[PDB]
Design a binder for this molecule. Structure first.
Ligand SMILES: CCN1CCN(C(=O)N[C@@H](C(=O)N[C@H](C(=O)O)[C@H]2N[C@@H](C(=O)O)C(C)(C)S2)c2ccccc2)C(=O)C1=O
Ligand SMILES: [Cl-]
Length: 520
């Protein structure tokens, strides 16, 4: 004969996308418990109770009997409010209901990496759920119940503490763009028989991350056979050598140096440059001299290396650091990597060249998209955000307007010119960007793999007023080639097209426009 204090569950804060679409919601559920002492006096009600709980008659009876001594045991957790009230309507002595919450994720695996999930005890363990756990959580209340000798609840005596709900959090992500990106990366992953992939979409004016998806993914609503590898928000927490996708930045350093201009011709014959023991190679060996634009179009390692030798590595390091490569994003996503921008006291030729064409440094997809955002935004870099921004934040002019404008023009040519990356063309829009392909690092030794690759494409659109930047990374494609401009480019094409239409961006290239775009 005494008083027990029992918890009152608190509503966990609603997570929404930028426009209010629910991404994580605490849904009301009903838990049924029983006092075996009471149930032992109504044994004749058991078979009906067992059948309403979908449980074997004897196994149910066994459960109650071996707990006859106890005053509390769970019957079933997480019924619907209707299902629980269906069993309560039976009026079985000793059977009680308590209303709890289940965390539900409406978009499931589409946004699992960004949103993350809570555990059995309602604490965030991954993604945004972990990052904003304090904001989201809220605080359970307490109430007192009176129980008799046998443990029968006879009275709800008082509330000693009210439950307070957690706070709503609006993510920067646009769920429409998330669905599109998710589906297209998946399709790409499956078409190409890739092992993994990431896709990031960024608003270049505001810094908001509009979409961030990875493969493999998982269903946070059903984690039964979850494996660790599927949990990774790779766009944020995995690092890679960006390869030729950093060339527009090497190029920006070159134009910033006052030593180079777009018309300058670099001689690249015969597509190799031996420097001591190390040998720089071009995969395209069809041209023997290229202007600055042609170095990007042909993606000449040799061309960019000779430029790098002239301007020096510190020039290139600087722009790369300024556009945030290898730097802290300030996002605070759990597990997020800063990457690495190597810094030697003395820069040999080897390290100077490889940096210039994107090796010996490591970035994340997020960082790469952020760097292209700055270039896309006329050289103004804007702070990354994974929450909705109200005011457009102040930027930092990291590349001059003129140089950014010139490098924009060149990247538009990388996509639109003959010999360029034509699979990256966006119907109805002028797009700009740069493909890349990187040999994966050897497993168990230093060096590069013979037959495993990472396909990259980074870019932005519309060229005439860039609105969004996008990075597509695909690991180990094995079925339809491996080059960036073959694997990742068509994904950029499709997602960029869909994204721009979804955001109502008017088309700037009507010659190539779609069915209804040509009507408006
Ligand atoms: C530091 C040592 N070390 C590390 C490894 N390593 C590379 O893995 N190199 C890349 C490479 O050069 N890729 C090119 C690029 O992106 O520019 C190609 N990508 C295509 C595309 O994006 O479609 C292209 C536009 C047709 S050219 C390569 C070479 C051969 C096959 C696949 C990939 C080096 O080079 C290198 O010296
Ligand atoms: Cl010029």
């Amino acid at each position: 004969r005494s008083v027990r204090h029992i918890a009152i569950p608190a509503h966990r804060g609603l997570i929404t996308d930028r426009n209010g679409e629910p991404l994580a919601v605490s849904t009301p559920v009903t838990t049924l418990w029983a006092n075996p002492k009471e149930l032992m006096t109504a044994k004749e009600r058991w078979p009906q109770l067992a059948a309403a709980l979908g449980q074997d008659t004897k196994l149910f009876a066994d459960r109650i009997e071996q707990n006859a001594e106890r005053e509390f045991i769970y019957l079933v957790r997480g019924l619907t409010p209707e299902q629980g009230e269906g069993v309560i309507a039976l009026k079985v002595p000793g059977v009680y209901s308590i209303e709890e919450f289940r965390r539900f994720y409406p978009a499931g695996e589409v946004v699992a990496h960004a949103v993350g999930f809570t555990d059995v005890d309602d604490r965030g363990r991954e993604g945004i759920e972990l990052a904003f756990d304090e904001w989201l959580a809220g605080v359970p209340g307490k109430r007192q119940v009176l129980k008799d000798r046998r443990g029968r609840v006879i009275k709800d005596v008082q509330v000693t503490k009210n439950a307070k709900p957690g706070k709503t959090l609006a993510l920067s992500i646009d769920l429409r763009l998330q669905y599109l990106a998710h589906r297209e990366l998946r399709n790409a992953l499956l078409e190409n028989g890739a092992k993994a992939g990431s896709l990031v979409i960024m608003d270049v004016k505001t810094g908001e991350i509009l979409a961030m998806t990875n493969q493999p993914t998982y269903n946070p609503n059903n984690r039964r056979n979850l494996q660790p590898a599927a949990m990774r928000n790779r766009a944020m927490i995995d690092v890679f050598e960006p390869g030729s996708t950093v060339k527009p930045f090497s190029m920006s350093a070159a134009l910033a140096s006052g030593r180079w201009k777009p018309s300058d011709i670099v001689d690249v014959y015969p597509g190799t440059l031996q420097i001591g023991r190390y040998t720089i190679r071009d995969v395209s060996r069809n041209s023997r001299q290229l202007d600055l634009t042609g170095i990007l179009i042909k993606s000449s390692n040799v061309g960019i290396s000779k430029i790098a030798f002239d301007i020096g590595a510190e020039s290139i390091y600087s722009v790369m650091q300024q556009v945030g490569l290898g730097q802290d994003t300030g996002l605070g996503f759990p597990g997020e990597r800063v990457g690495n921008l190597p810094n030697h006291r003395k820069w040999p030729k080897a390290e100077t060249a490889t940096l210039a064409y994107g090796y010996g440094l490591s970035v994340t997809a997020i960082q790469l998209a952020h760097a292209y955002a700055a270039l896309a935004n006329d050289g103004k870099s804007v702070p990354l955000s994974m929450t909705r921004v109200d005011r457009v934040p102040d930027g930092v002019q990291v590349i001059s307007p003129e140089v950014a404008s010139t490098v924009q023009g060149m990247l538009q040519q990388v996509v639109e010119a003959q010999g360029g990356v034509f699979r990256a063309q966006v119907p109805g829009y002028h797009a700009a960007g740069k493909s890349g392909t990187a040999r994966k690092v050897s497993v168990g030794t230093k060096g590069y793999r013979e037959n495993a690759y990472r396909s990259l494409f980074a870019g932005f659109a519309p060229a005439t007023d860039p609105r969004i930047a996008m990075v597509v990374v695909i690991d180990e494609p094995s079925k339809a080639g491996y080059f960036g401009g073959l694997v990742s480019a068509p994904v950029f094409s499709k997602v960029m097209a869909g994204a721009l239409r979804l955001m109502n961006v008017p088309p700037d290239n009507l010659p190539t426009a779609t069915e209804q775009q040509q009507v408006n």
